[PDB]
Write an enzyme that holds these catalytic residues in place. Structure first.
Site, short mmCIF file in Angstrom:
data_model
loop_
_atom_site.label_atom_id
_atom_site.label_comp_id
_atom_site.label_asym_id
_atom_site.label_seq_id
_atom_site.Cartn_x
_atom_site.Cartn_y
_atom_site.Cartn_z
N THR C 1 20.10 31.66 -34.82
CA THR C 1 18.96 31.58 -33.87
C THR C 1 18.99 30.26 -33.13
O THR C 1 19.46 29.25 -33.66
CB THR C 1 17.57 31.66 -34.60
OG1 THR C 1 17.43 32.92 -35.27
CG2 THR C 1 16.40 31.51 -33.60
N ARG C 29 15.07 45.95 -38.03
CA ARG C 29 14.32 44.77 -38.39
C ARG C 29 14.18 43.78 -37.22
O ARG C 29 15.13 43.55 -36.45
CB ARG C 29 14.98 44.12 -39.62
CG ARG C 29 14.34 42.83 -40.11
CD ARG C 29 14.95 41.61 -39.42
NE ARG C 29 14.44 40.36 -39.97
CZ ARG C 29 14.76 39.16 -39.50
NH1 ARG C 29 15.60 39.05 -38.48
NH2 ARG C 29 14.22 38.07 -40.03
N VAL C 30 12.98 43.22 -37.07
CA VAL C 30 12.71 42.24 -36.02
C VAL C 30 12.09 41.02 -36.71
O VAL C 30 11.17 41.15 -37.51
CB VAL C 30 11.73 42.79 -34.97
CG1 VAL C 30 11.27 41.69 -34.05
CG2 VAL C 30 12.41 43.89 -34.17
N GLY C 31 12.66 39.85 -36.44
CA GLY C 31 12.18 38.63 -37.06
C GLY C 31 11.08 37.91 -36.30
O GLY C 31 10.33 38.53 -35.55
N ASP C 32 11.06 36.60 -36.45
CA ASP C 32 10.05 35.76 -35.81
C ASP C 32 10.36 35.34 -34.38
O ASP C 32 9.46 35.00 -33.62
CB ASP C 32 9.83 34.49 -36.65
CG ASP C 32 11.02 33.54 -36.60
OD1 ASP C 32 12.15 33.96 -36.92
OD2 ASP C 32 10.81 32.36 -36.24
N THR C 52 13.15 28.01 -36.61
CA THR C 52 14.38 28.69 -36.98
C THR C 52 14.42 28.74 -38.50
O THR C 52 13.82 27.90 -39.17
CB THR C 52 15.64 27.97 -36.42
OG1 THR C 52 16.82 28.72 -36.73
CG2 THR C 52 15.77 26.56 -36.98
N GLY C 53 15.08 29.75 -39.05
CA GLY C 53 15.15 29.89 -40.50
C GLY C 53 14.99 31.34 -40.90
O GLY C 53 15.52 32.22 -40.23
N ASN C 54 14.29 31.58 -42.01
CA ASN C 54 14.05 32.94 -42.50
C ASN C 54 12.82 33.49 -41.79
O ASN C 54 11.69 33.27 -42.24
CB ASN C 54 13.81 32.94 -44.02
CG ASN C 54 13.47 34.33 -44.56
OD1 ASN C 54 13.57 35.33 -43.86
ND2 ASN C 54 13.06 34.38 -45.82
#
Ligand SMILES: *[C@@H]1O[C@H](CO)[C@@H](O[C@@H]2O[C@H](CO)[C@@H](O[C@@H]3O[C@H](CO)[C@@H](O)[C@H](O)[C@@H]3O)[C@H](O)[C@H]2NC(C)=O)[C@H](O)[C@H]1NC(C)=O
Ligand code: NAG
Ligand code: NAG
Ligand code: NAG
Lengths: 161, 141, 141, 161
Positions: C1, C29-32, C52-54
């Site tokens: 990211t 799946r959709v992240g942040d 950025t990250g999990n």
């Protein structure tokens, strides 16, 4: 001030009753929220919840739902869920069966089918008419802008000038 | 859209939403409902909130998260909800939106943006103090 | 990211992200990253932040919005960024995450949660004084 | 003045460079952000941005992106973008050509095609290989929990307990 407490937007009394009934039977807050919202999916509350409402430009009804656990702050959600009526049910399965937070579109449908949900059309004669009347009306209203033909007068396909 | 908040007898809080979006939305559009902090938010240490109205605008101001954030700071539920509406109001005076609030001890409130077509907001409440779900109303600000 | 914050010379701020997500994520799946207030947030009246990250975890705490909210109240960029990391840290002590903050005047900072496998976070900077993309670095807390 | 300022996550210097260049050419803050992020899509920065990376359980690469205007506070975002390489380019189009905030899935791919973007496979030999070694390691790691068969030892498909 005393608990339990159930609060919901709009005067959708049956959802309130459904949630309270879940708590009264020993269900948790998650069970209550899910029950109350699923009730409105079934009853198509104000035509703004569940199938048979708010058809998009192509005439398809797609659902969005989420459920949040305030203790662990775990969340289960789906956006643009297609061909599955129990949106908040699928959202809860995302919370219980994955470490993810949000699943979307046709991919979320596949997930829902894996979790036991029935893949079915979300249209109704009522939502089909609404869409055809909208088309006859030159697609008003819509949410396009800075495109041709004039989105304030015509239907698409649209394209930037 | 339906946004719901529930506080279990044990103090455990949960929130959720369900919606079919807005009529004639562009194919594939996702509103504020499935977005944490936008459509709904729950935190056992602060309280919970849920929003409804024009999701396109609402999701940019994270109403449910900010409402809970105010209550975390000590704000009365109603005042927390009102403050959220005001912040958005300054950016979009004519946005459609309503928010429900509730702190950890069972106090609830609500608020909405005043429009020519929207001057009151009705929401359901079911307390142990009440033996039936009662409809509450708030005048929009 | 990749999360990026940019402040024009006029003082107009913008923020953005782009990512292919996490490996072997469940189909759909959709992240942040695409979520306002989680992956990035910008406000000309306060500042901007990107995370950025999990994303599965970060998404639930709206890190970029809260970082900007702190800066809205005068907080120093590095401090606003560390405070955001601290709150998540309280819930998920083993969470992978890094945030970059910048206020309206041009001050920047960053913070990351310290893991045995993640001890320092590098980020690029570019402004008038530095006439070269300068790689900054911070130790995680 | 300390302004302009460009700050981005990770040691992605070429992205910082493209953003600065956009500003130098009299570009807006938004032009800079789009330029910086797109640069990493082309370069596939750390294999965590752009096509040919992070294949999902099915081997497909799907992108998410967002761009936000601090002045108006308008946001253009795409999630689960399939078969379109310039994710942030599409997200910017959601901002400029619709009054919506987020578009997702194959539906977003259609939107992108209308805006002139090319539909194309996001896979490469590298990402497929990544996927195959995964199948080989019995789908470890994955993001499923409380399903049958045991996600910690076996691949899918899964069913509720
Ligand atoms: C949840 O929200 C409610 C409503 O805002 C909060 O209740 C209010 O709590 C304060 C105490 O913090 C009460 O006022 C104090 O009241 C006592 C009454 O004996 C008085 O001696 C003090 O000088 C002051 O007036 C107030 O009465 C009470 N309001 C209501 C309607 O119950 C409650 O504190 C919030 N809970 C949490 C955990 O924040
Ligand atoms: C739910 O709502 C509708 C509208 O008020 C009402 O006609 C219906 O009878 C309610 N449900 C039940 C089980 O009574
Ligand atoms: C930006 O950050 C610096 C360092 O904390 C601070 O002195 C400055 O006043 C901040 N600007 C604003 C507008 O708060
Ligand atoms: C930019 O960075 C990449 C790594 O992302 C590197 O491979 C490339 O050589 C750099 N660009 C140029 C034009 O040299």
């Amino acid at each position: 001030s005393p608990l339990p407490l159930v609060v919901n937007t709009w005067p959708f009394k049956n959802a309130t009753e459904a949630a309270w009934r879940a708590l009264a039977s020993g269900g948790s807050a998650l069970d209550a929220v899910e029950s109350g919202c699923a009730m409105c999916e079934r009853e198509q509350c104000d035509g703004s919840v569940g199938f048979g409402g708010s058809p998009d430009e192509l005439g398809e009804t797609t659902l969005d739902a989420m459920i949040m656990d305030g203790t662990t702050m775990d969340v289960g959600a789906v956006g643009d869920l297609r061909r599955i009526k129990n949106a908040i049910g699928v959202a809860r399965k995302v919370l219980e069966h994955t470490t993810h937070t949000l699943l979307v579109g046709e991919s979320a449908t596949t997930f829902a089918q894996s979790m036991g949900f029935i893949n079915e059309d979300l249209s109704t004669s009522a939502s089909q008419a609404l869409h055809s009347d909208w088309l006859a009306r030159n697609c008003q209203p819509n949410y396009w802008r800075n495109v041709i033909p004039d989105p304030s007068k015509y239907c698409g396909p649209y394209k930037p000038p | 859209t339906i946004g719901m908040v529930v506080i279990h007898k044990t103090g455990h809080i949960a929130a959720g939403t369900s919606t079919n979006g807005i009529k004639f939305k562009i194919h594939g559009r996702v509103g504020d409902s499935p977005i944490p902090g936008a459509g709904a938010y729950a935190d056992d240490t602060a309280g919970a909130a849920a929003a409804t109205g024009n999701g396109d605008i609402l999701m940019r101001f994270l109403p449910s998260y900010q409402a809970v954030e105010y209550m975390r700071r000590g704000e009365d539920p109603t005042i927390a909800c009102q403050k959220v509406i005001s912040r958005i109001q300054k950016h979009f005076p004519e946005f459609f939106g309503a928010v429900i609030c509730a702190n950890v001890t069972g106090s609830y409130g609500a608020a909405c943006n005043k429009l020519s077509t929207f001057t009151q907001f009705s929401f359901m409440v079911y307390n142990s103090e009440k033996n039936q779900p009662t409809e509450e109303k708030v005048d929009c600000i």
